[model samples]
Target: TCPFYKKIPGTGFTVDAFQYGVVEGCTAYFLTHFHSDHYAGLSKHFTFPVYCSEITGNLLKNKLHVQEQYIHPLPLDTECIVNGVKVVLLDANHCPGAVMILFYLPNGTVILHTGDFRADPSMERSLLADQKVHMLYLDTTYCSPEYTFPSQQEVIRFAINTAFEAVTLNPHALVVCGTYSIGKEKVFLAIADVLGSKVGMSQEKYKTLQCLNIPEINSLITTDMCSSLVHLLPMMQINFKGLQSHLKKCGGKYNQILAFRPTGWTHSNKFTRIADVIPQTKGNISIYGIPYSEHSSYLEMKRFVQWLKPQKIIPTVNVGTWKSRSTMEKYFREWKLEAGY
Candidate 1:
């Protein structure tokens, strides 16, 4: 809340707070994930040591051209000391290299930063499950009771099944998958494998994928635009008008477009089951709004807080608005001592 900058208090550590330029009293800068919002202010000329997960470090060097010496890659599940501060990285279940950072400050304050994480039942078996967390920096993207969505397994199944049916029905139709810099790989990859369709992406995007440990993804890629009916484009560019032009630019042989825009924004509590969530078909375009997200839902977040029983909490997302921050605190009153669900 201090000037709206995200930094670990009591210690001189800055976490995903790159926009503040060189943070005051910052000894080490920690990156929770490779998302642009987390590392927005990073530059080639930037001075300071950047700590992040192993995969995230490769991304920084490959995409942003950051030097190797300054980028420190930490192993998962192992606590490492940086300037007398004990830190560990836990799988955030958000995206590739996304992690929830656990910082054990020397002053006996333990802070857990859930950096854009989706809570899973498996998290209950983590090392910190028995430790007392003093302050939890949560990704409050969906801290309200209204937010709800289906399982990732269900969403991926629907994506693959629907895509397979669509391609089988009309082999000439182009299938576009809405993608981001990272995440949502399983859905598109499984879809491509099932249909035996080649993947279309920018050369830069393809090169970046190589940095990750995702096996056989590169072999599925094809530079020939016409050869691959399945194209991976940014989620924001998967609309009707822009898609029409993209298909046309590829010679218009495929008149119809089936774009699957997978994002949490498409989630709704009204859809009780996977079968209820259907695609929006209009003319030659079929838009599948998959209720897929990496962030934890309201109930999931509540469960984690209750199990951990953290002494205090700080909302990482929606922090700009004081109203939103206070609104999120409404759920804290109900979180009692509990165990794995």
Candidate 2:
């Protein structure tokens, strides 16, 4: 269970503060990524200056239309002070512009708020020496024993192979890959690169990808739907009804529809191959729930906490209340106590 404690106690800083109202003493605002859930309450009328990675800043401008002056892009892995609190932005390995923040307060209190992230060993290589974080604002999206899944690199290849075989079986099928605003790009990008097909999407999404400066998509993107069999659509558009309606608008250029809904909910520890998880098909639409996620797995979460050994943890997702949050503490209780935390 992730907690709702967005505000760090020692400083006037708030990471992903949109979930709460104008928090008390919130002198500065921070955005870890561009996902709608993390930036839910943010809008053009926001009052505080927002700090985030340079890529995330671009999405805020191009996608959300946030005013240019209010968005501040911090260089990754660099240390700087804002309003008297030292802060650093580290690569989150979650999405295009996502980052995990490290804060050093004046009172010798250290804090690390991992905004939505997928844990990897390399992430721990950058921590400042002698920096022992006191409060760890974690992303407990999959903080459970059963939420395990394969690594993102494996999942990306698995998804590409799954989509590749499906499209090859029915060459005339229009492939629709479900994607978020910024994440899940690698799955589709790799699939398109391998299949030698153009990617079709709305003009805004095309512009959003442009902000990321993806050069491979240079000659492969087209707003004209008929020109590309493989298209990128939101998760809601992967349903049978949605795929059917989309097919009707495109005439008879494509006979079948193959959609890849790449999310973590469909996978677990038992999975190792694409054939392990079956798919669904209705009429001419076939839907595959690709086991791909940007969030860390249960084991990954375990590794992250043990490596950091923070004093206390305040999760950032699924924490309905303290009762719910208590369940998660058990998972890390032994380790935290092992080192006298």
Candidate 3:
């Protein structure tokens, strides 16, 4: 609605699409990994050739059901030209297929948009070491001092050690898990990464890995064997009536089912339910409270902006872009306004 830009709506894209009309004259080279919020609107507007890593392209095709023809796939850290922009995809360790984009424009502006990132030294080292950073758009989802994430090693330890504990407690228990489509797969990989051996996963579960970028996550699963451990598959039918029956089957085997709900803090009250809120045979439950996120926390955003030290900081949450517009506003109101669009 502002004069500087407009947006578009419907066709499963951002409202800004309505305003800007999908960059009809101009071309934008999209750089993204598997975070749904980051690429949710991609297929809607990008009818032309869009570029991404091969890992991302596969996920977009199989998981998102998008046409693969539109993609021009490259490996991680590959530099390529699209339209008039020079783009490079970098590793973003936040999750499998997660990536950041660095834009080298004709005007000599190098804009780095770090999609979502983690502090994993190996992964983080690459970006932090990129000496050529000019304008860095970062994922500060957990940048706040209070927002702490268990390092990659710690989270891996927790998931596996806990799963091992489940085996001792109940030899045969059905476990139901929920995790972000993008992040939870890492938990599976963590199990494998720790064991240094292949873990068992159901065929359906194996299908899910096709969308993920981290090979380690699926390295452990053995398609032929479901006896050692049953890998519970994620479902789009979270609230569907099918869950009860699924749970009932698990009950027959006395198999313990674990639930992991991987999501950002949307529909807050739903997850904040009181005990026995839904009244059912309570299964053994443990929540892994790892704040693995794709956006920046308050302090993270501040640090990113401060580092960039742009001549002018333009504030727009890029609302309606999977990230809640209101969440970005939280940062702006607390800081001084420099200008308006």
Candidate 4:
């Protein structure tokens, strides 16, 4: 089973610290990113030493209030010995400080845990370094063939231009974009720079963005929401009911509310090409789910597996028993992915 911390029976090495209840027992802890799902049980009172990217280290120290002495910062593309285990951190391309962990065990076995990443062209050369990957812990969020999406650049351009177009079409409309707590800062910045509009963000999010040190965006935070045409809201707060409540709060200050969600699930439950933009009106809000994603698509996952040719394929999601294992095996096989025997 590909448990939360994939531990070798003999060796004392743990992968990620998401689902681990007993942190003190793990020999070494590695954090993939700062996503809540990945860092579920982490807190300021953490006792064990955690390894992550430099940005992630700063986040742990500043944001989560984790003691700096407990956080270890690993530089990108560099190998180091942590507690007698050889480890290297590679750029995950998912978000800032996200990394794919490569572990070289004492038994000469190589394990690659691709902690949430998009297998784009830029990562191809590094992955094809002529090393045999014994175990591959893949991110199968979009393991189904219906989850194909356009490149990040194209999706960003579409989202920025669309926000501007929506505002231009309806000058009084309130433009709102959905994003995760950590990722998609660029979407808001681009809208501000291109449309000459200040974006409204919560005080907490503003503080988080300040750590990035992009003065242009830092200066564009609108304290007065009424004067700002574009608003960056958390993904959970962009639904129809939420928008209606937000509209009521605005009290006729806006003509309409245009909501855009930058996700690969634009045409969810159906197959569609990348860069496709579909618009539908839900009640009084014009909502668009753009084709954007940070995780690798189904085809991309297949290509990654083919390239690695790992001895064993381990699906990182819900991997606790034989049922889940068989489910993932059949699931990948249906998508023409050579995951496991």
TM-scores of the candidates are 0.92, 0.90, 0.66, 0.84
Candidate with the larger lDDT of 2 and 4: 2
Q: lDDT (CA) for every model shown?
A: 0.82, 0.80, 0.50, 0.75
Q: lDDT tens string, model 1, 207-300?
A: 7787777767658886666678788887788888878778778775887888988777443655557777767777899897788878888888
User: Per-residue alpha-carbon lDDT of model 4 for 1-341, expressed as tens digits?
Assistant: 23644554334656666465774456667888888888777778987888899888877777888997898998888779988888889988787788998888888889888888888766668844758888888887776666666667877787778777877877787888887768766776777667777888777776676655455654687667766777877899878888888888877888788887776555562665434556778755888777667788777777777666777767776565687577678865644443443
lDDT of 2: 0.80
Off by over 4 Å in 4: 1-5, 8-11, 23-25, 127-130, 212-227, 248-253, 264-276, 282-284, 318-324, 330-341
RMSD of 1: 2.4
lDDT of 2 by residue, 149-253 (tens): 777777777777877887788788788888766777877778887888778898877888887756666887778777777898877888988889888888788
Candidate 2 wrongly placed segments (more than 4 Å): 1-4, 19-21, 128-130, 267-273, 337-341
Q: How many residue pairs in model 4 have overlapping backbones? A: 0
* Model 1: residues with Cα > 4 Å off, grouped in runs: 1-5, 337-341
* Top lDDT prediction, candidate number: 1
Per-candidate clashes come to: 0, 2, 35, 0
